[PDB]
RNA sequence: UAAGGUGAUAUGAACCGUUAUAACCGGCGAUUUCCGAAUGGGGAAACCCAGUGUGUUUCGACACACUAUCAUUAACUGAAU
RNA sequence: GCUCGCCGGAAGACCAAGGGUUCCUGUCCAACGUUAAUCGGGGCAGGGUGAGUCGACCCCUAAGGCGAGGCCGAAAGGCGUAGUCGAUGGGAAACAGGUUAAUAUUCCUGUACUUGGUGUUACUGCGAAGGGGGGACGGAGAAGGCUAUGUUGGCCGGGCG
RNA sequence: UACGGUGCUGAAGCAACAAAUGCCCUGCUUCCAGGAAAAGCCUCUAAGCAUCAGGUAACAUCAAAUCGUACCCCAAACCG
């Protein structure tokens, strides 16, 4: 299965937001994720009257790699790796290092 | 002056077409080679 | 009957296109993209049943696909059939 | 209380061209308002709305990609909805 | 929508069968082509529904 | 097996799914136009035309199935004799 | 648009063969155009080919091709009967006018015709993959009769330079 | 008329002379080098059917599918 997935809260490990937490918006089958308030790129978008868009520079979040994030433990308050155990026939994720099921 | 190619589809098909090609052991080997070569037009037909 | 109700999926789209279509509306008849294997009589039936209108006679023609675009290779469109249908009198749709 | 004898029509355009949307009502004397997917913009330099009442005609020019929605007109009690998509070059 | 009609009677099914075409499919094409049909995905199913319809009935009778 | 999916260029539209009938992978099925050994006859491959059977609370014409050749075996037929 | 000049048994007009959207309309001028290009048989988009009667398919065969069996050949194959294919020839039938930006003997108006199925009503020996007839045919030459077609007058409308 | 065109209306519409390489003529005359085939069509009957079925006519009606049909075609669209 997939370790980092859709509605999760995670903390960044590497590059320019290094240490910035945020929630995963979506997760792209390139092996990337879009996480809110983490990577911001100022796209230049033309104003459109039909769509009632003001135009000019807008701010959005680019896709970072899945390996550049790890999910935030919040019981230790640090980054933590994820494993998969079976509980009652459910393949659940669990935090390593305190072994807690998510 | 009158040059060598004087087009005519009836003759074309009758002389080089699929069925004509098919009507002779060697004509068939013609196709076989072209198939093995992976040719996109076995024999320029309709 | 003669044509199964299933096979009266021959009507494929109206060809409301060009004054050709509409100016030949304003003087009887409607025109339509219609199947490919459709048999005039076979397509009259469709227009009787569905559309529930009257139909005097139907003419057909085949449109040939324009081939276009591309650099080295080339792309061609599909052929398709035209309707031109001519309704009897109490003309509606 | 009137209706829409003639609904709109989905049309395509290559950003820059000009889209067209027509719609006839039943009673003259009125003033509706067109709106993309559902946004009431405002006839400006990129919007050409010319209606004489008894009739309503729209004329959008170089339509952007956003216009990718439907043209739903609104008037008294009538309501139309065509399809419009803005394709790039 | 499968076993929902694995048990729906050979004769009975030929009904929805037509009802997929007789109604949805023909009306949808016409309505669509004519620039109405704003929800295109209806064309995907219906077609896919008829496929199911014909998968049974074929597997129920004779096969 | 699963939290994400509706192949690629390829965005977009309209959707579908999240604890099990979303998608994806494997096993076995189903459907499988036309041409091509092509095999009902023909033919300038992807087309023309049939015989016979079936098929119609709108039982006409069209649709479908079958009909190549050779060999072996059987059965029935059967010349000059 | 007004002059000027050129073809007029063509340098006009309709096709077959061959091409295969070059047709028509909007739009663009980078590349293509031996220059410019607002224009194009060039780019992009949309439109446009309507038939019982024209033609193919179809029936019929020529040359010739293929060819169940068959005769022949080291194998491959060759030739050929019954057949079956093959038009460059035979075979039923629509004309004058109008209309589209773009088709029209196909669409529309007027006026027709061909062959089968079925029915009614009369009247009657019907009946072949068979017999016979026909279809069915050369070159040159000679006029007569006639139409297309032309010229003039009359007629009609307009002109008084 | 949006100056490309587009509508509307509408006279006479006869005679004489000339006249083809076209038609009559797949004729006619003549000559030697002696001038496709098969079907459609007409007729004849065999097996076969004899009240039937078929055949002939008048009128009525129904069927005639499918595929081609744009444009160039002594040429800037075909072979060069
Ligand atoms: Mg046609
Ligand atoms: Mg065959
Ligand atoms: Mg065969
Ligand atoms: Mg071109
Ligand atoms: Mg042009
Ligand atoms: Mg230049
Ligand atoms: Mg062009
Ligand atoms: Mg023959
Ligand atoms: Mg042999
Ligand atoms: Mg031979
Ligand atoms: Mg011929
Ligand atoms: Mg023309
Ligand atoms: Mg009778
Ligand atoms: Mg004879
Ligand atoms: Mg005369
Ligand atoms: Mg004077
Ligand atoms: Mg023409």
UniProtKB/Swiss-Prot annotation, chain B:
Keywords of the record: Ribonucleoprotein, Ribosomal protein
The keyword Cytoplasm is assigned to this record: no
Pfam families with a match to the protein in the record: Ribosomal_L34
Subunit-structure text: Part of the 50S ribosomal subunit.
A Gene Ontology BP annotation from the UniProt entry: cytoplasmic translation
GO molecular function: structural constituent of ribosome
Family: Belongs to the bacterial ribosomal protein bL34 family.
Cysteines engaged in disulfide bonds, as pairs: none
Protein name according to UniProt: Large ribosomal subunit protein bL34
GO cellular component: cytoplasm; cytosolic large ribosomal subunit
PANTHER family noted in UniProt: LARGE RIBOSOMAL SUBUNIT PROTEIN BL34M (PTHR14503:SF4), MITOCHONDRIAL RIBOSOMAL PROTEIN 34 FAMILY MEMBER (PTHR14503)
Organism domain of life: Bacteria
InterPro entries in alphabetical order: Ribosomal_bL34, Ribosomal_bL34_CS
From Swiss-Prot, chain C:
Gene Ontology MF terms: rRNA binding; structural constituent of ribosome
GO biological process annotation, one example: ribosomal large subunit assembly
The gene coding this protein: rplW
One cellular-component annotation, GO: cytoplasm
Effect of residue 52 to K: No effect on trigger factor binding
Protein's organism: Escherichia coli (strain K12)
Matching InterPro entries: Nucleotide-bd_a/b_plait_sf (IPR012677), Ribosomal_uL23-like (IPR013025), Ribosomal_uL23/eL15/eS24_sf (IPR012678), Ribosomal_uL23_CS (IPR001014)
Role description: One of the early assembly proteins, it binds 23S rRNA; is essential for growth. One of the proteins that surround the polypeptide exit tunnel on the outside of the subunit. Acts as the docking site for trigger factor for Ffh binding to the ribosome (SRP54) and to nascent polypeptide chains.
Origin: domain of life: Bacteria
Family designation: Belongs to the universal ribosomal protein uL23 family.
Record keywords, A-Z: Ribonucleoprotein, Ribosomal protein, RNA-binding, rRNA-binding
PANTHER family: 60S RIBOSOMAL PROTEIN L23A
Subunit comment: Part of the 50S ribosomal subunit. Contacts protein L29 and trigger factor. Might also contact SecE and probably does contact SecG and SecY when the SecYEG translocation complex is docked with the ribosome.
Entry-linked NCBIfam families: PRK05738.1-1, PRK05738.1-3, PRK05738.2-4
UniProt protein name: Large ribosomal subunit protein uL23
Swiss-Prot record, chain D:
Known tissue expression: Isoforms 3, 7 and 8 are expressed in cardiac muscle. Isoform 4 is expressed in vertebrate skeletal muscle. Isoform 6 is expressed in skeletal muscle (at protein level).
Mutagenesis / variant outcome for changing residue 44 to F: In a metastatic melanoma sample; somatic mutation
Compartments reported by the entry: Cytoplasm; Nucleus
PTM statement from Swiss-Prot or TrEMBL: Autophosphorylated.
Domain of life: Eukaryota
Remaining remarks: In some isoforms, after the PEVK repeat region there is a long PEVK duplicated region. On account of this region, it has been very difficult to sequence the whole protein. The length of this region (ranging from 183 to 2174 residues), may be a key elastic element of titin.
Disease: Myopathy, myofibrillar, 9, with early respiratory failure: An autosomal dominant myopathy characterized by adulthood onset of weakness in proximal, distal, axial and respiratory muscles. Pelvic girdle weakness, foot drop and neck weakness are the main symptoms at onset, but ultimately the weakness usually involves the proximal compartment of both upper and lower limbs. Additional features include variable degrees of Achilles tendon contractures, spinal rigidity and muscle hypertrophy. Respiratory involvement often leads to requirement for non-invasive ventilation support.
Family of the protein in this entry: Belongs to the protein kinase superfamily. CAMK Ser/Thr protein kinase family.
Stated name of the protein: Titin
Species this chain originates from: Homo sapiens (Human)
From Swiss-Prot, chain E:
Gene3D superfamilies named in the record: 6.10.140.1970
CDD domains to which the protein is assigned, alphabetical: Ribosomal_L29_HIP
Any coiled-coil regions, as ranges: none
Disruption phenotype: Cells missing both S17 and L29 grow very slowly and have a rather unstable temperature-sensitive phenotype.
InterPro entries from the UniProt entry: Ribosomal_protein_uL29, Ribosomal_uL29, Ribosomal_uL29_CS, Ribosomal_uL29_sf
Similarity section: Belongs to the universal ribosomal protein uL29 family.
Record-given protein name: Large ribosomal subunit protein uL29
UniProt organism field: Escherichia coli (strain K12)
């Amino acid at each position: 299965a997939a370790k980092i997935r859709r509605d999760d809260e995670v903390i960044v490990l590497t590059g320019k937001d290094k240490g910035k937490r945020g929630k995963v918006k979506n997760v792209l089958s390139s092996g990337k994720v879009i996480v809110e308030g983490i990577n911001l790129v100022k796209k230049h978008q033309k104003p459109v009257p039909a769509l009632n868009q003001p135009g000019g520079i807008v701010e959005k979040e680019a896709a970072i790699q899945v390996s550049n994030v790890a999910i935030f433990n919040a019981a230790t308050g640090k980054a933590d790796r994820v494993g998969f155990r079976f509980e009652d026939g459910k393949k659940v994720r669990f935090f390593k290092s305190n072994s807690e099921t998510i | 002056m009158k040059r060598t190619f004087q087009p005519s589809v009836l003759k074309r098909n009758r002389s080089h077409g699929f069925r004509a090609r098919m009507a002779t052991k060697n004509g068939r080997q013609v196709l076989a080679r072209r198939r093995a070569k992976g040719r996109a037009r076995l024999t320029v037909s309709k | 009957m003669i044509r199964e109700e299933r096979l009266l999926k021959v009507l494929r789209a109206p060809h409301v296109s060009e004054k050709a279509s509409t100016a030949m509306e304003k003087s009887n008849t409607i025109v339509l993209k219609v199947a490919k294997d459709a048999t005039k009589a076979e397509i009259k039936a469709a227009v009787q049943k569905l559309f529930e209108v009257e139909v005097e006679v139907v003419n057909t023609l085949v449109v040939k696909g324009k081939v276009k675009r591309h650099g080295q290779r080339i792309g061609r469109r599909s052929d398709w059939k035209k309707a031109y249908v001519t309704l009897k009198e109490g003309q509606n749709l | 209380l009137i209706e829409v004898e003639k609904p709109l029509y989905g049309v395509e355009v290559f950003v820059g061209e000009t889209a067209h949307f027509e719609i006839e009502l039943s009673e003259p004397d009125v003033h509706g308002q067109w709106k993309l997917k559902g946004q009431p913009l405002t006839a400006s330099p990129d919007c050409e709305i010319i209606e004489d009442g008894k009739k309503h005609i729209l004329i959008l020019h170089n339509c952007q990609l956003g216009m990718t929605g439907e043209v739903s007109f609104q008037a008294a009690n009538a309501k139309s909805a065509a399809n419009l998509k803005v394709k790039e070059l | 929508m499968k076993a929902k009609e694995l048990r729906e009677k050979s004769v009975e099914e030929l009904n929805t069968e037509l009802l997929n075409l007789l109604r949805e499919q023909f009306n949808l094409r016409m309505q669509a082509a004519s620039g109405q049909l704003q929800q295109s995905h209806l064309l995907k199913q219906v077609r896919r529904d008829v496929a199911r319809v014909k998968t049974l009935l074929n597997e129920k009778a004779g096969a």
